[PDB]
A paper describes a structure:
AimX also inhibits the function of phi3T_93, a protein that promotes lysogeny by binding to MazE and releasing MazF. In all structures, phi3T_93 shows an identical all-helices fold composed of a longer N-terminal helix (α1), followed by two shorter helices (α2 and α3) connected by a long unstructured loop forming a V-like shape.
Only a short fragment of AimX (residues 8–22; 30% of the protein), which folds as a 3-turn helix, is visible in the AimX–phi3T_93 crystal. The main contacts between AimX and phi3T_93 are nucleated by the projection of AimX M14 and M21 towards the hydrophobic bottom of the phi3T_93 groove generated by the side chains of K13, K17, W16, M20 and L23, pointing to these hydrophobic interactions as key for phi3T_93–AimX recognition. Additional polar and hydrophobic interactions stabilize the complex. The portion of AimX visible in the structure corresponds to an area of high sequence similarity with MazE and YosL, explaining why all these three proteins bind to MazF. Despite the structural differences between phi3T_93 (all alpha fold) and MazF (mainly beta fold), both AimX and MazE use an identical recognition mechanism by introducing a helix in the groove in the dimer’s interface. To test the potential binding partners of AimX, we used biolayer interferometry (BLI) assays, which showed that AimX does not bind to the master repressor phi3T_97 but binds to both MazF and phi3T_93. AimX can also bind to phi3T_93, preventing it from binding to MazE which would release MazF.
Numbering used by the authors:
A (entry chain A): 2 to 67
B (entry chain F): 10 to 22
C (entry chain B): 1 to 67
D (entry chain C): 9 to 22
Write the structure that this text describes.
């Protein structure tokens, strides 16, 4: 409850803004540029802890699972 | 998956 | 009351993390401008009910979350 | 900018 940033109102905003961005990723050529960027980033130290999310995004596995 | 995020939006009621 | 099947806390975490990955993508050269052009169209798309504040926070460069 | 706010929330997760 003492969280300043990871809050339920913010989670809500992120969820909605993420849906807005997902439909952008469908736009022509955005898809392939995103996968290309994920490729460029796969060896990058700043993304330790994000391996499962990188894999799900590159493999086409869903953003959320039931 | 957008459909699933949408369903998840339907659950914020 | 139904327990949530999609808007679960574990999904909120993955979406949060996946959103950070896409944020850095949006900074890539050319992506930002094509994003803003996409927001300019979508703002008129009648399939987005209740997203108006989010569409304009994004279009006008407001932060994704609020302290 | 807004990414560092995201990152601070992430470090607030665990
Ligand atoms: Ca490395
Ligand atoms: Ni209009």
């Amino acid at each position: 409850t003492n969280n300043k940033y990871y809050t339920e109102e913010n989670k809500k905003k992120v969820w909605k803004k993420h849906m807005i961005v997902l439909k952008f990723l469908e736009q022509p050529g955005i898809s392939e540029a995103y996968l290309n960027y994920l490729q460029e980033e796969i060896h990058n130290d700043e993304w330790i802890g994000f391996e499962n999310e990188f894999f799900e995004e590159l493999t086409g596995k869903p953003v959320i699972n039931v | 998956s957008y459909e699933e995020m949408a369903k998840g939006y339907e659950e914020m009621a």
